[PDB]
Amino acid sequence: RGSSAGFDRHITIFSPEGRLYQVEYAFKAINQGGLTSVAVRGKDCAVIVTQKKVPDKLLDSSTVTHLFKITENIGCVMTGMTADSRSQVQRARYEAANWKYKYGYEIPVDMLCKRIADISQVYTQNAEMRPLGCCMILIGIDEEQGPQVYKCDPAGYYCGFKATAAGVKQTESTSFLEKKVKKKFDWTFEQTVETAITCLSTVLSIDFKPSEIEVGVVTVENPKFRILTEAEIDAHLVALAER
Amino acid sequence: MEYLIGIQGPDYVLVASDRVAASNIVQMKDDHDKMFKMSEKILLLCVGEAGDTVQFAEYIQKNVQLYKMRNGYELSPTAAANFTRRNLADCLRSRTPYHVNLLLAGYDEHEGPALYYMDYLAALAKAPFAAHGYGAFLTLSILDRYYTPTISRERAVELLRKCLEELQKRFILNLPTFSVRIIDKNGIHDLDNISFP
Amino acid sequence: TTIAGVVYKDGIVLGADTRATEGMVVADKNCSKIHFISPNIYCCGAGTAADTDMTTQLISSNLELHSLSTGRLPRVVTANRMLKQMLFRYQGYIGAALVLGGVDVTGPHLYSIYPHGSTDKLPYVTMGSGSLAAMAVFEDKFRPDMEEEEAKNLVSEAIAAGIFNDLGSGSNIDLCVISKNKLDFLRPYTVPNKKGTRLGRYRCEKGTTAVLTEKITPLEIE
Amino acid sequence: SRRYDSRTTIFSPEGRLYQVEYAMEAIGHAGTCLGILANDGVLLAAERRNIHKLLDEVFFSEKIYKLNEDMACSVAGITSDANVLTNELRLIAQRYLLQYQEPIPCEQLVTALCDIKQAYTQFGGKRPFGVSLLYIGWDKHYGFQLYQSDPSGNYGGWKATCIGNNSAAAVSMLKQDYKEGEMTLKSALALAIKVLNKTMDVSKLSAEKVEIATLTRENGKTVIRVLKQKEVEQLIKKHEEEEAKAEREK
Amino acid sequence: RGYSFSLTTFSPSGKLVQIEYALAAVAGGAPSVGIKAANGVVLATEKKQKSILYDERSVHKVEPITKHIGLVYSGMGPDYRVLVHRARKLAQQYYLVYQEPIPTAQLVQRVASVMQEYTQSGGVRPFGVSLLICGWNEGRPYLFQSDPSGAYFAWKATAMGKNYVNGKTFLEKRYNEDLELEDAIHTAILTLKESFEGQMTEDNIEVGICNEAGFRRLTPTEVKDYLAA
Amino acid sequence: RNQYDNDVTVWSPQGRIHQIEYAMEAVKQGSATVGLKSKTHAVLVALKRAQSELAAHQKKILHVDNHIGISIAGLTADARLLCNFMRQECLDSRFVFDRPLPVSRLVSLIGSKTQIPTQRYGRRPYGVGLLIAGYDDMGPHIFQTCPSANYFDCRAMSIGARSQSARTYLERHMSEFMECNLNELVKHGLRALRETLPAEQDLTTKNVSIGIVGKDLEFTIYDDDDVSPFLEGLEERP
Amino acid sequence: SIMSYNGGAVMAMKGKNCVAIAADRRFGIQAQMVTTDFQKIFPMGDRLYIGLAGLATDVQTVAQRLKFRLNLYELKEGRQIKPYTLMSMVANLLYEKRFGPYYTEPVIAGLDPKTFKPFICSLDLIGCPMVTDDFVVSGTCAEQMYGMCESLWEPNMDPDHLFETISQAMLNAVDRDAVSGMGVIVHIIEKDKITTRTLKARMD
Amino acid sequence: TGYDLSASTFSPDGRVFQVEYAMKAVENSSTAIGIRCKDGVVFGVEKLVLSKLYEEGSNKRLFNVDRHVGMAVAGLLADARSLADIAREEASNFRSNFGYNIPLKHLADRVAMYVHAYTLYSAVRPFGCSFMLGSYSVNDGAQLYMIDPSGVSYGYWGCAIGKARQAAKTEIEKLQMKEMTCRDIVKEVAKIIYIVHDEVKDKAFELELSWVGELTNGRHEIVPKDIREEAEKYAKESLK
Amino acid sequence: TTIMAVQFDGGVVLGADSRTTTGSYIANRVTDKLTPIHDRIFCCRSGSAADTQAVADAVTYQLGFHSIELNEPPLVHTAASLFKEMCYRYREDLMAGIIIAGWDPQEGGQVYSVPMGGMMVRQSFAIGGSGSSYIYGYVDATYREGMTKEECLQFTANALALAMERDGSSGGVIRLAAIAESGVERQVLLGDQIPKFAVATL
């Protein structure tokens, strides 16, 4: 099946089957980072959780973080190559501000993820430049739609999700989540946070402490993106462990 | 200042020009040639601001002879006229406007003789007779009087001499001698220069 | 030219005359000074007519792109910002004075745009030659939260004042009513002035005119 | 980057351009096409390769691609490159008309396009235009004309020719059958049907398979007319009758 | 800046192997189908999602270019989105110039010109998608297919993606020119059902129609109503 | 094997760029030269190679400005290119600020211009090694340049073929050079350069060129005629 | 008045299943005539005509550019252009030169090819479309022929009455201005045929 | 593998091997450390002296990219100087536009993105240098950021780059910089460098030190020679 | 028009009229010249309305991008510097006079004045527009160090009313704003709310 001809593996051109082997290798590069992130939307809130693995004590834990603030009402979590991630969030910030300047209102997350995916497309189409080895997950509140969660990939797939996972444990995490959403739930704020943390803790076997993870939220009551402090995270965790 | 005149007929085009090149009060030259041949059977007459005339004329001459060498057959007078009109019209908007007043003349085996007129604004027109310069105001009424589409070439030369002698008597500038040449199926023919001592 | 707009309770009413003048002679007696930007956004134009028409067409295009890309209806602030940025880029040389009106999710929004790129969000605006008379009518009789019929009558009275007191404007009144749910484009909403009947018949019989040539060419049809 | 480059615009040790050689080979696979000059007119004829039943007919012709009042061009090879070249041709002709206010000569049009094709051969590092296309038209200088073009950027004037599949067999048939200076449009149509029947793999020309267009001068205004299915049906019927009469004789 | 040499080049056989391979990716694409009725034209495709977690309403494989044109694809989605964006820009350029809605024929000509521009241009791969374009102009319906090569064909009805050969055989068996779009929708849904490999529902597929009114993608409710048959 | 070497933008698996090393090897083949300084004076001494007996020897030492002079090694075309660049930099300095350009800032510019090509495709390092010498308000300076754009600051240095003998001689005698007269300093440098020569060859007026700069003395190149006084008192080969 | 440099006048009128378009013949400098055979009406279709007045060089240039674009359109589409479409194309063409404009004021007149419905329009210096149901004008004697047409014109006229009307209007108008005249040509368009007639007019 | 010859490629296991090969180079360079403390930040370098000929201050591996921020590098010194030029340009443009001294976080981000541009395209190689930036502002405080050739930027309480990165990190880890101040920190910085220096493999070194903090009024500068000598003496004596 | 700003301890006060004129005709009698560049940073606008709106939007764009990438609240000096470079680079084209005021933690309440020509000056109190001429004396006399929020608001209202009665271009309703750590308190004085001063009334 997996035949190869010419420079199909070395650059972004079609294999005899049309697979574009390179973008698949870029997908492997996401798991090369070694971390995992999970997203889930409720009726009134959306969240993103991810590991916070500090290899050295000397590193400032404040600086290292995969959660970023694209706008006041948008936040994202990046997984993969840290450098390409920072490039993508900078480009997203640019596109958001330019959208505001041109069209006069805050960009929707769907349009943002579509713009980012088109950008990644021009990478995977042109041979000069490699695809960025990162995947973005965006959360935001749309006034009409409600809470929203979208994920981008190096290829350009930009779908919208009720819940998502990204990283090395993506398949296990989505297997976990597919069972939960298959069952009916109210999906309140505390329930969403508990679901996300449980998914991460179950796939990793970590049994997290407060510093071990980071989390960000958006609520219809408080649409601004907020990265919860260690106190709030520990408050949620102690609640989880008790029940 | 410079004077051009053209008379179409059944089987020929007659053209004339003054041979004066003047910068100012003085007359520098008395044998200036304002007639440029773009091919064997078409002529271009150009007058206006100095330099623009020869530059534009030589450009058109180059393009026409190039067409001939490339394709093996000469342009028709109509095609040459529209070509020079295009090149002139493109430029009036540009930073390099050519202020030139033109009069084209040619013979086509199929379409017969032709005379075209275009001002510095590059407005083309096909006319039976036409003239340029301040002298045109004097001489056009002569042609409108004594011109017939069936005019023979001897009668045409006679009519020309009438126009030019009227210029000599009535026009302030000194245009002593005029170049003359005829276009027909055989080709361009130079004639005895009309002079007034 | 006299264009005017007003916000009523649940939408917008735009109004305009139909007289287009080249100099001081009438050229078009039933012009359409009301343009389509979007299904929910409309605009009326004054000033250089070509500039207004082409600008409105351009912004209509860009908003068509934006709307069908987003999957949701376009907003008014978007149009206002596009227009003002364009007009500022050209620094007033394109003489498009516009009153722009539309209804979107946030509510009815009405803008007045000037050639140099200025804007003003207002409840009522008037532009053109009869703008002062229309402003007089509005400053007199405008009240907030009017009903649709009251707003239509007000705008009609304003455009009529501009008509019967300005030389440039005349010949008809056009109306457009945008709301959350409908759009009523009323081209001959009113006919205040009409051409009087011709008393004398001056129809010329055949052969009245001489002809020196005639050439008939048949057109094949199938 | 030197590693990922094909290096198309280079010579070969034998002195060849392998890319245009291969483009000619691709044209060898394309649907066959031919054009036949006559004293009174010229006609293009093609094998409509897209013969599927579900295909609609929303175009004037599948391949004929009119360029101007006085000329047209059938096609062999990649339809995409063909469409691009036809657009370029139309632009060229209308540019000449804008300049001189006379219709363009066919030789000049073909020369312009062939120069464009040659440029892709020589520089740019781009692939050539893998298209060979006939041209037919009328100019006052030389009258009815037929021209052939190749991806190499070289053209020729032919009295009758074929491009595409089995062009060699078509030409072998045309050499013997074509009568120099002794042809009319009807006889040329018959010869076209003959060589199409000989060259095409179809047992019989259904009149869906073929597409024919003619060029003629009527009242000082040239006309480019695609022949209708009834006309070509009558033609193939006449050809079958003639073939039977020849066979019945012997 | 960028590579300036063609990545697609002629094989000794004469075939553009990159184009053949792009067509292979299209063949591996999801099913899609189009049927041109007398009164209208229908475009349909399956929207099979890997998991229930995905939101169906988020993304649409059926996208409208204008009021009266909409198209669907089989193959690479990002490439499809590049193409649909550029097509919208082209159609609105036409509208700015002519103040008349673009004919679908000219649209597909232009986008095919683009798709040609990519295969010939340097430092790029061909678009790995084929499109089905539907339109209603001059009170007539249209259906077109644009391949990666940049070649446009016109069909009364056709299919794309997996099992397109069997789908086209079935469609040639079941197609009538006199059909109304009401029955055409049933035939298209049946064609997709031939290769759906599942229990298709309102979420599992996407469909759109074009008519005198214009192009619209049917909501899941009426899609379910049609699926009842 | 040929991989990792054909291009400059390719890091080797051992964390090296072979093309830069090769350009440095180009300098290691070139004609030998010496640079040394004292409290007040800076000297540049050169062996000028001759392609044949009849050929005149190559111009190793160049003028850049009154207060700066260079001695080249390796590709003379790259050398003349860099020298034109440096001349333009110093001329721009005098045009703008009406001051002599400092040597340190000049070599900073040189390193920048030399670093840009070695990080891009389809460009080569400047396969040249230089010794800079000048006098500024600070004092005499000697800077070495390599195709690798890194530069150095040194009391003495020698680059070219068989330069290592000169380097060890200079390392041995570095102590005295700081406090020396001009004649003593140039004689030290000449002995150092003499070490680089083959045992058969010997220094001559023809094959030697000297460039000297100082507080009052502008940069002056002493050709074969006027180089004889400096080497007049030199000892014989041991 | 740069428009008055060459003068000229063009007019169009509507009727029942018919349109008429007319224009003067004079080509002249600001006071000097040159030719009485100038083409200001150019055919843009089988039964669609455009008429240009203003600076003659811009008249010719615009007609040539328009024929260029139009032939490309007719070749690409495969159909004849509609009048509204030609109007829009002309407006785009003129607005492309909005700074440094073509000094001409076009007039288009024709029938829709499918329904044979009359269409007339005019465009300003810079491409302001102006569709009307009765008549349109462009030229120096516009002010004259406006009132002349306002009086003579009547709705749903047949071709005969249309010809007599447009002829009387053009003659009595151009007789009253200096820089236009020297004859006038009248093209009548209807579904079955095209009719062109020149009128006897004062050559003064 | 054929996947290692350009940075526009990817390994089948997801790695761009050119970047890894690049950071091998900085790992083959003499080590440098920077240690943040309450008062400010201190930098230190093991500048191997290649020859007795080279003058004191040659191959300076400590730059001042702006007055309020310092720099300390490893790897290819040419690329280091180039990035110092880039950083100075970024700081100057920031001051010119926004009117104040650039924050070190933004500076490190901009520099890292400029680095990261190079590892994507094939026309350009990755940088061969990893480097530490350090600054002190009264509002922002002491701040230290280390950058790698991959373009990844992280803040550090103490950072090390070069061959002896690991042992340096250990010796820093036992330090407890948070309570300390600069005048104390310089001494054990010297200690750590003298430790990790290999007398056998590395012939000799010249300690290059730089600091910034409130003591300098937010002005990065090289250590006065008196303190440099005192710290070197303490280090050698403690070394035993 | 008349625009005015005053710095009090812990914040600032902004005041401006609501009149914009084209000649002697008032196109808009309720225009809002106070513009939020950011949550705690505001801009008053004098001169060409087009120029001021344009540069305000561009500065808002740049400053939002800068603030979000820094992840810290922006500075009034920064916004004023942006306005400065824009107005200085385009001093020939732009006829615009700006006064910027906001609150930031580092420096607190700040007022900067960017007149025509693109120079930037921090000021305790700064007035602009056609009507500032008529009230230079009133502010010079009335100002005192240590004024409070309500005191500064009344000061600004009196000044703007005095300018409005005399200047034809200035007029309408007074729009006021007060910016501090807490947030923005905007209010509009109209009719009798506006302070009144007795005419000569001979």
Distances (CA, A) of F99 to A214, E118, F94: 58, 56, 5
Q: Is I55 helix (H, G, I), strand (E, B) or coil?
A: helix
Structure tokens at A234: 């520990």
Other residues' Cβ atoms within 10 Å of the Cβ of residue G199 = 21
G contact residues 107-146, partner C, Cβ 8 Å cutoff: 122, 124, 126-130, 132-133, 142-143, 146
Largest Cα–Cα separation, chain E: 56
The technique by which this structure was obtained is cryo-EM
Give the distance from residue D136's alpha carbon to the nearest chain A alpha carbon, in angstroms: 39
Q: Which residue of H has its CA nearest to A91?
A: H113
| Gap between the Cα atoms of H106 and H109, Å rounded | 5
Angle at F197 between CA F191 and CA F202, to 5 degrees: 75
Q: Residue E169's domain spans which residues?
A: 17-228
Give the distance from residue A108's alpha carbon to the nearest chain D alpha carbon, in angstroms: 38
Q: Is H117 helix (H, G, I), strand (E, B) or coil?
A: helix
Structure tokens at H66: 């702006």
Q: What is the CA radius of gyration of chain G?
A: 16
| Gap between the Cα atoms of D44 and D134, Å rounded | 8
Our measurement of the distance from residue G192's CA atom to the centroid of its chain's CA atoms, rounded to an integer in Å, reads 21
How many residues can be counted in chain E? 229
Q: Is G202 helix (H, G, I), strand (E, B) or coil?
A: coil
Contacts of D60 in chain G (CB under 8 A): 78
I47: left (phi over 0), alpha (psi -120 to 50) or beta: left
Our measurement of the distance from residue E41's CA atom to the centroid of its chain's CA atoms, rounded to an integer in Å, reads 12
H92 close contact with D: CB closer than 8 A: no
Phi, psi values for residue F232, rounded to 5°: -65, -40
Give the distance from residue A11's alpha carbon to the nearest chain D alpha carbon, in angstroms: 9
Those residues of chain E whose CB sits closer than 8 Å to some CB in chain A are: 2-3, 7, 17-18, 21-22, 24-26, 28, 51-55, 57-59, 76-79, 81-82, 85, 123-126, 128
Domain ranges (residues) in chain C? 2-190
Q: Which residue, F157, F130, F116, is CA-closest to H81?
A: F116
C58 to E64: CB separation less than 8 angstroms, yes or no = no
B83 contacts D107 by C-beta, under 8 angstroms: no
DSSP, res C117: S
Q: Which residue, C75, C32, C24, is CA-closest to C52?
A: C32
The secondary element (H helix, E strand) that includes residue H35 is: strand H32-36
| Gap between the Cα atoms of A108 and E58, Å rounded | 13
DSSP, res G81: P
F229 contacts F194 by C-beta, under 8 angstroms: no
Residue-by-residue DSSP string for A199-231: HHHHHH-----STTEEEEEEESSS-S-EE--HH
Phi, psi values for residue F92, rounded to 5°: -65, -40
Q: D3-13: string of b/e by CB count within 10 Å (b at 16+)? A: ebebebbeeee
| Gap between the Cα atoms of F93 and A122, Å rounded | 45
Structure tokens at C64: 């068509």
Largest Cα–Cα separation, chain D: 70
Give the CA-trace dihedral at D58, D61, D66, D69, to 10 degrees: -80
The secondary element (H helix, E strand) that includes residue H193 is: helix H182-196
Our measurement of the distance from residue I40's CA atom to the centroid of its chain's CA atoms, rounded to an integer in Å, reads 14
A79 contacts A170 by C-beta, under 8 angstroms: no
* Residues of C assigned a catalytic role: 1
Amino acid identity at H125: R
Structure tokens at F115: 């670093």
Contacting chains of B (3 CB pairs or more, <8 Å) are D, G
Q: Which residue, D157, D194, D155, is CA-closest to D178?
A: D194
H contact residues 5-44, partner D, Cβ 8 Å cutoff: 5-6
Residue-by-residue DSSP string for I152-196: HHHHHHHHHHHHHHH-SSS-S-EEEEEEESS-EEEEEE-GGGS--
* Strand H69-75, strand I121-122: pairing: unpaired
DSSP, res A10: T
Give the CA-trace dihedral at F197, F200, F203, F209, to 10 degrees: -50
Distances (CA, A) of B151 to B189, E108, H65: 18, 61, 92
* Strand H69-75, strand H62-66: pairing: antiparallel
Structure tokens at C189: 């909403």
Phi, psi values for residue A225, rounded to 5°: -75, 125
Contacts of H57 in chain F (CB under 8 A): 153
Give the distance from residue I169's alpha carbon to the nearest chain H alpha carbon, in angstroms: 34
Distances (CA, A) of B44 to A197, A226, B32, B56, I6: 90, 81, 15, 11, 78
Phi, psi values for residue E22, rounded to 5°: -65, -40
| Gap between the Cα atoms of H21 and H25, Å rounded | 7
Amino acid identity at B8: Q
Largest Cα–Cα separation, chain I: 63
Structure tokens at H133: 């930036």
| Gap between the Cα atoms of G9 and G27, Å rounded | 11
G204 contacts G182 by C-beta, under 8 angstroms: no
C65 to E89: CB separation less than 8 angstroms, yes or no = yes
Amino acid identity at C67: S
Evaluate whether chains G and A are touching (3 or more beta carbon pairs less than 8 Å apart).
no
Largest Cα–Cα separation, chain H: 55
* Residues 6+ positions from F175 with CB-CB distance below 8 Å: none
I60 close contact with C: CB closer than 8 A: no
User: Which CATH code is given to the segment(s) C2-190?
Assistant: 3.60.20.10
Q: F15-27: string of b/e by CB count within 10 Å (b at 16+)? A: bbbbbbeebbebb
Structure tokens at A54: 């500090």
| Gap between the Cα atoms of H19 and F11, Å rounded | 8
| Gap between the Cα atoms of H99 and I107, Å rounded | 14
Closest Cβ opposite residue G128 in set C53, C203, C214: C53
F91: left (phi over 0), alpha (psi -120 to 50) or beta: alpha
Our measurement of the distance from residue E125's CA atom to the centroid of its chain's CA atoms, rounded to an integer in Å, reads 20
Q: Is C52 helix (H, G, I), strand (E, B) or coil?
A: helix
CB-based contacts of D142-146 (< 8 A; 24+ apart in sequence): D142/D107, D144/D37, D144/D38, D144/D41, D144/D42, D144/D215, D145/D37, D145/D42, D145/D106, D145/D107, D146/D35, D146/D36, D146/D37, D146/D42
| Gap between the Cα atoms of G21 and G195, Å rounded | 11
Question: Which residues is C214 bridged to in the sheet?
Answer: G197
Q: Which residue, A74, A75, A84, A164, is CA-closest to A119?
A: A84
Most G-contacting residue of C57, C208, C209, C212 (CB-CB within 10 A), to test interface: C209
Contacting chains of H (3 CB pairs or more, <8 Å) are A, D, F, I
Domain ranges (residues) in chain D? 18-249
D4 close contact with A: CB closer than 8 A: yes
Phi, psi values for residue C115, rounded to 5°: -65, -30
Angle at E184 between CA E182 and CA E185, to 5 degrees: 70
Structure tokens at C207: 């052969």
The secondary element (H helix, E strand) that includes residue I122 is: strand I121-122
| Gap between the Cα atoms of G46 and C220, Å rounded | 9
CA atoms within 13 A on the CB side of G44: 34
Q: I16-36: string of b/e by CB count within 10 Å (b at 16+)? A: bbbbbbeeeebbbbbbebbbb
Distances (CA, A) of D93 to A111, B77, E106, F1: 44, 19, 20, 56
Contacts of D3 in chain H (CB under 8 A): 5
D127 contacts E8 by C-beta, under 8 angstroms: yes
CB-based contacts of B108-111 (< 8 A; 24+ apart in sequence): B108/B41, B108/B76, B108/B77, B108/B78, B109/B185, B110/D140, B111/B76, B111/B77, B111/B78
Q: Dihedral sign, CA of D7, D11, D12, D13?
A: negative
Distances (CA, A) of I154 to B36, I150, I188: 87, 6, 13
Contacts of D108 in chain B (CB under 8 A): 70-71
H124 close contact with D: CB closer than 8 A: no
| Gap between the Cα atoms of C62 and C83, Å rounded | 11
| SS3 annotation, chain F | CCCCCCCCCCCCCCCCCHHHHHHHHHHHHCCCEEEEECCCEEEEEEECCCCCCCCCCCCCEEEEECCEEEECCECHHHHHHHHHHHHHHHHHHHHHHCCCCCHHHHHHHHHHHHHCHHHECCCCCCCECEEEEEECCCCEEEEEECCCCCEEEECEEEECCCHHHHHHHHHHHHHHHCCCCHHHHHHHHHHHHHHHCCCCCCCCCCCEEEEEEECCCCCEEECCCCCHHHHHCCCCCC
How many residues can be counted in chain G? 204
Residue-by-residue DSSP string for D114-142: HHHHHHHHHSSS-----EEE-EEEEETTT
CA atoms within 13 A on the CB side of C28: 20
| Gap between the Cα atoms of H29 and H164, Å rounded | 9
F150 to H128: CB separation less than 8 angstroms, yes or no = no
DSSP, res I133: G
D1 to H6: CB separation less than 8 angstroms, yes or no = yes
Give the distance from residue G153's alpha carbon to the nearest chain B alpha carbon, in angstroms: 34
* Residues 6+ positions from D48 with CB-CB distance below 8 Å: D31, D62, D63, D208, D209, D210, D211
E222 contacts E42 by C-beta, under 8 angstroms: no
Could you tell me where the beta strands, DSSP code E, fall in I9-65?
11-16, 20-22, 25-28, 35-36, 41-47
Q: Which residue, B144, B149, B133, B164, is CA-closest to B8?
A: B149
Q: Which residue, D6, H108, E161, is CA-closest to I69?
A: H108
Distances (CA, A) of F102 to D144, E133, F67, F127: 80, 70, 9, 24
Amino acid identity at B60: I
H5 to D3: CB separation less than 8 angstroms, yes or no = yes
Our measurement of the distance from residue C1's CA atom to the centroid of its chain's CA atoms, rounded to an integer in Å, reads 9
Q: Which residue, H71, H69, H52, is CA-closest to H61?
A: H71
Largest Cα–Cα separation, chain C: 69
Q: What is the CA radius of gyration of chain H?
A: 18
Angle at I92 between CA I90 and CA I93, to 5 degrees: 70
Domain count, chain H: 1
E141 contacts E210 by C-beta, under 8 angstroms: yes
Distances (CA, A) of A96 to A90, A132, E85: 10, 20, 19
| Gap between the Cα atoms of F211 and F104, Å rounded | 19
Q: Dihedral sign, CA of C162, C168, C174, C179?
A: negative
G80 contacts G45 by C-beta, under 8 angstroms: yes
Distances (CA, A) of A243 to A181, A236, I2, I53, I136: 20, 11, 64, 57, 70
E9 to D1: CB separation less than 8 angstroms, yes or no = no
A156: left (phi over 0), alpha (psi -120 to 50) or beta: left
Structure tokens at D233: 């049906």
| Gap between the Cα atoms of G51 and G55, Å rounded | 13
Residue-by-residue DSSP string for E68-106: SEEEEEEE-HHHHHHHHHHHHHHHHHHHHHHSSPPPHHH
| Gap between the Cα atoms of C50 and D25, Å rounded | 55
A20 close contact with E: CB closer than 8 A: yes
Q: Is G26 helix (H, G, I), strand (E, B) or coil?
A: coil
Q: Dihedral sign, CA of G167, G168, G169, G174?
A: positive
Most E-contacting residue of G80, G92, G108 (CB-CB within 10 A), to test interface: G92
* Strand E63-64, strand C211-218: pairing: unpaired
| Gap between the Cα atoms of C218 and H137, Å rounded | 91
| Gap between the Cα atoms of C71 and A144, Å rounded | 12
Q: Residue F55's domain spans which residues?
A: 1-238
Give the distance from residue I196's alpha carbon to the nearest chain A alpha carbon, in angstroms: 39
| Gap between the Cα atoms of C54 and C66, Å rounded | 18
The secondary element (H helix, E strand) that includes residue C151 is: helix C148-163
I183 contacts I105 by C-beta, under 8 angstroms: no
Structure tokens at H62: 């400590």
Helix, strand counts (H, E) of chain H: 6, 10
Residue-by-residue DSSP string for chain D: --TT----S---TTS--HHHHHHHHHHHHSPPEEEEE-SSEEEEEEE-S---TTB---SS-SS--EEETTEE--EEE-HHHHHHHHHHHHHHHHHHHHHHSSPPPHHHHHHHHHHHHHHHHHSSS-----EEE-EEEEETTTEEEEEEE-TTS-EEE-SEEEESTTHHHHHHHHHHH--TT---HHHHHHHHHHHHHHHSSSSS--SSSEEEEEEEEETTEEEEEEPPHHHHHHHHHHHHHHHHHHHHH-
A215 contacts A228 by C-beta, under 8 angstroms: yes
Give the distance from residue E198's alpha carbon to the nearest chain G alpha carbon, in angstroms: 43
Q: Which residue, G124, G86, G141, G109, is CA-closest to G15?
A: G109
Q: Dihedral sign, CA of A205, A211, A216, A219?
A: positive
Domain count, chain F: 1
Fold assignment, D18-249: Glutamine Phosphoribosylpyrophosphate, subunit 1, domain 1 (3.60.20)
Distances (CA, A) of E179 to B92, C27, E41, E223: 61, 51, 10, 19
E120 to D59: CB separation less than 8 angstroms, yes or no = no
I114 contacts I120 by C-beta, under 8 angstroms: yes
